[PDB]
Amino acid sequence: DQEILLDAGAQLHRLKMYPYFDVAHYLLMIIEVRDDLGSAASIFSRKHPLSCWLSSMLMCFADAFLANFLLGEPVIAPFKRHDDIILATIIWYLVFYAPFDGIYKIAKITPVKCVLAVMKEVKRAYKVSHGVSHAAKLYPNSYIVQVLVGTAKGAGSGIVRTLEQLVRGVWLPTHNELLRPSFATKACVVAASVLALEKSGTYLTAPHDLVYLVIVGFFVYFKLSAVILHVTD
Amino acid sequence: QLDQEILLDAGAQLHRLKMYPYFDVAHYLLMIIEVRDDLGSAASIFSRKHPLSCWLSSMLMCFADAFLANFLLGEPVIAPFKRHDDIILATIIWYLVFYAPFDGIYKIAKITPVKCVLAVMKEVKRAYKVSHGVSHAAKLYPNSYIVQVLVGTAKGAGSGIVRTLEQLVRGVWLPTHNELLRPSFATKACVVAASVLALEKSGTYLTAPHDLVYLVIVGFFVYFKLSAVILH
Amino acid sequence: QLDQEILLDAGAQLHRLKMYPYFDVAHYLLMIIEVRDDLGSAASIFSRKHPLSCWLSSMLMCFADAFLANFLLGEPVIAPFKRHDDIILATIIWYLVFYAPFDGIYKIAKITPVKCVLAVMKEVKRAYKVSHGVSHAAKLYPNSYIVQVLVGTAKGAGSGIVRTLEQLVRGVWLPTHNELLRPSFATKACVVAASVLALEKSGTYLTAPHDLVYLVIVGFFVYFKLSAVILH
Numbered sequence: 001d002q003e004i005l006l007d008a009g010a011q012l013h014r015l016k017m018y019p020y021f022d023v024a025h026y027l028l029m030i031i032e033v034r035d036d037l038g039s040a041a042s043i044f045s046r047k048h049p050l051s052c053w054l055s056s057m058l059m060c061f062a063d064a065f066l067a068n069f070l071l072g073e074p075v076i077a078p079f080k081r082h083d084d085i086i087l088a089t090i091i092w093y094l095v096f097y098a099p100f101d102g103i104y105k106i107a108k109i110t111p112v113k114c115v116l117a118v119m120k121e122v123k124r125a126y127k128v129s130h131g132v133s134h135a136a137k138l139y140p141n142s143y144i145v146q147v148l149v150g151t152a153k154g155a156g157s158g159i160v161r162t163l164e165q166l167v168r169g170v171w172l173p174t175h176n177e178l179l180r181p182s183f184a185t186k187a188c189v190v191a192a193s194v195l196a197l198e199k200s201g202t203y204l205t206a207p208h209d210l211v212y213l214v215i216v217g218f219f220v221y222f223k224l225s226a227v228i229l230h231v232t233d
Numbered sequence: 234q235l236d237q238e239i240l241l242d243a244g245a246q247l248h249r250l251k252m253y254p255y256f257d258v259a260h261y262l263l264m265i266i267e268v269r270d271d272l273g274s275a276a277s278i279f280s281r282k283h284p285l286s287c288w289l290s291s292m293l294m295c296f297a298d299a300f301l302a303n304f305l306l307g308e309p310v311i312a313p314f315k316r317h318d319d320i321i322l323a324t325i326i327w328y329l330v331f332y333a334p335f336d337g338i339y340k341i342a343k344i345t346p347v348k349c350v351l352a353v354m355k356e357v358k359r360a361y362k363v364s365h366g367v368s369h370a371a372k373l374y375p376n377s378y379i380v381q382v383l384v385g386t387a388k389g390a391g392s393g394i395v396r397t398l399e400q401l402v403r404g405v406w407l408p409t410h411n412e413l414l415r416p417s418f419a420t421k422a423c424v425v426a427a428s429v430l431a432l433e434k435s436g437t438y439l440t441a442p443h444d445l446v447y448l449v450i451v452g453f454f455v456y457f458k459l460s461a462v463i464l465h
Numbered sequence: 466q467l468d469q470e471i472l473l474d475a476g477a478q479l480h481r482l483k484m485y486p487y488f489d490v491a492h493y494l495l496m497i498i499e500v501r502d503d504l505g506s507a508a509s510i511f512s513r514k515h516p517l518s519c520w521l522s523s524m525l526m527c528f529a530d531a532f533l534a535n536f537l538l539g540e541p542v543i544a545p546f547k548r549h550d551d552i553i554l555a556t557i558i559w560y561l562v563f564y565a566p567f568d569g570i571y572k573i574a575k576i577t578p579v580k581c582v583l584a585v586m587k588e589v590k591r592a593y594k595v596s597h598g599v600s601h602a603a604k605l606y607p608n609s610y611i612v613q614v615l616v617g618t619a620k621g622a623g624s625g626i627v628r629t630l631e632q633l634v635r636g637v638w639l640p641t642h643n644e645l646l647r648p649s650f651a652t653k654a655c656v657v658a659a660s661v662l663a664l665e666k667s668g669t670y671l672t673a674p675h676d677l678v679y680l681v682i683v684g685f686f687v688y689f690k691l692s693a694v695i696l697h
């Protein structure tokens with residue numbers, strides 16, 4: 001059975017994010033930006049589009065904004081990648097202005113959400129990885145920094161969310177999407193510890209493709225266990 | 234016929250026109266005035282009991298756009314405190330608005346006409362700012378037009394964000410930011426303007442001297458501000 | 466002649482004095498105790514149930530001045546996490562203050578004598594911070610003296626800003642940042658000792674021994690801290 005696994009991992013590693021995983025992410029995030037505008041969503045979206053778009057972009061690339069800040073790199077940075085900004089703006093356009101509010105309505109249907117919900121955990125596992133990597137690039141010896149920046153990209157979307165609100169002058173602790181994503185932060189810490197530990201090389205043995213597999217496996221295990229344990233109540 | 238002519242003259246002298254030291258004293262003046270007004274009934278006893286804290290905030294607001302521009306571009310937010318000239322001039326105005334004899338400087342700025350010129354002057358400077366924002370940005374990311382747009386807009390409208398973080402840090406909240414509700418259009422003005430300049434620099438499809446456009450946009454920043462001064 | 470030598474010898478030894486680890490275990494010690502208290506009644510449950518959050522909240526407060534300093538200067542704010550020996554030591558004090566057996570380390574720090582001892586050392590530690598802030602600012606921009614001062618003051622008495630933003634992100638507003646009234650003399654003392662050291666390095670307007678002047682401030686920060694315990 002092993003073979004097939006190392007084939008799973010070797011492929012996983014090669015798996016690109018653009019554009020399906022991205023659009024899954026951008027989709028879930030912006031649908032939330034909308035959902036949180038409370039009843040005001042409809043009116044605000046129509047009279048303050050830029051202000052609305054900006055809030056959506058902050059949440060789509062929140063992990064980057066956060067890492068950059070942590071790393072002394074220019075926060076504006078995420079706006080160089082025209083590819084991503086475009087795609088997200090499109091997804092942004094649809095969630096707020098799609099005809100017959102279709103796209104919004106389709107994502108909200110149970111089976112679909114779940115696909116997305118999973119796809120996203122793959123994109124997260126990916127971010128946790130690229131964080132620890134970039135971290136170890138600039139600071140190969142400082143493991144803590146690697147683990148933080150990793151956990152930063154894996155779960156720091158909440159912080160950017162809080163900051164955006166405090167600036168819009170609105171407090172909204174519905175910060176409980178699922179009361180479960182709290183698993184996200186701990187998961188991202190261990191997930192990052194490992195990759196951080198593995199890159200140093202000093203103490204663990206097994207192929208990256210195989211370990212990264214198990215962590216993406218877990219992320220998906222839980223984000224499902226959050227979807228499936230919510231539904232029974 | 235005659236209208237096309239007159240366009241070039243203003244630009245030349247406009248572009249030659251240094252904001253310093255009069256536009257800076259206009260701007261500083263208004264900003265530090267506002268810092269004093271939002272200080273409410275307290276303002277009076279605060280300025281005297283905590284001159285430094287009073288100063289910093291005033292400093293923060295005079296150069297707010299700078300502090301933001303830097304942060305966004307990774308640059309040291311401390312940098313504005315380097316230009317010793319700007320800080321000295323500003324601090325003077327600061328000193329006046331809060332401690333002028335018979336609080337004269339403050340009042341003279343209050344009258345409908347004066348306060349209206351200080352404001353029209355501030356509009357040119359703001360444009361001056363959106364210009365420098367787009368340029369410095371384009372200089373670093375010659376082809377990341379969004380970034381340039383954002384930074385220019387930040388440069389021309391970002392005072393609000395700094396204002397907010399300062400209050401948060403001081404544990405106080407006043408959503409009454411929009412003294413006028415044009416400033417939500419002001420930012421929009423800055424956004425369209427900034428992205429106009431971002432286009433010029435790209436060098437794609439555009440015919441008009443640089444001295445011609447800076448003046449055309451000023452007409453709009455002044456027009457929106459004037460449309461805000463006439464009504465109420 | 467007879468006693469002119471006793472004071473000159475103290476400046477050389479203070480210069481020889483390391484901060485690690487007896488001063489740090491004081492500073493980290495105090496800082497982390499405050500983190501604990503502020504969690505209020507829930508402090509107990511929260512520390513057991515959310516050890517990580519609690520830890521990061523601590524580290525933020527132990528190295529606050531660094532974070533603020535880095536941020537200001539344009540440097541990577543995550544930087545102070547590279548110093549393993551510190552995070553290591555600081556984490557121990559953290560472990561102790563929160564989960565010590567019979568909670569001894571915490572109690573010991575509570576007695577008026579010990580809290581007093583620690584209080585002073587930390588003050589030496591501050592002196593230290595103010596210094597390097599002025600230094601490192603001067604290293605990069607030795608002519609911009611304001612920056613050297615803000616950065617010195619930030620470094621010296623800026624943990625309050627970090628505390629504020631930490632609460633804002635935690636969704637709590639415990640504005641009673643006011644433990645003692647001294648942390649109000651703390652920021653000003655830091656502002657002076659900053660401008661004094663920023664002057665020294667300029668050397669342009671006065672000559673004085675580096676070990677005497679540094680020794681005087683260290684005593685002055687301790688003076689104000691003593692006045693808090695001996696006067697009230």
Ligand SMILES: CCCCCCCCCCO[C@@H]1O[C@H](CO)[C@@H](O[C@H]2O[C@H](CO)[C@@H](O)[C@H](O)[C@H]2O)[C@H](O)[C@H]1O
Nearest residue numbers: 144147148151182185189511515517518521634635636
């Ligand atoms: C070397 C690796 C170490 C780096 C790891 C990064 C640190 C992890 C931070 C996540 O910790 C979070 O802290 C929050 C505090 O803001 C908790 O809020 C929770 O608990 C609070 C009370 O303490 C409630 O007010 C909130 O509603 C509730 O969500 C949240 O659950 C917890 O996940």
Ligand SMILES: [Ca+2]
Nearest residue numbers: 171406637638
């Ligand atoms: Ca509140």
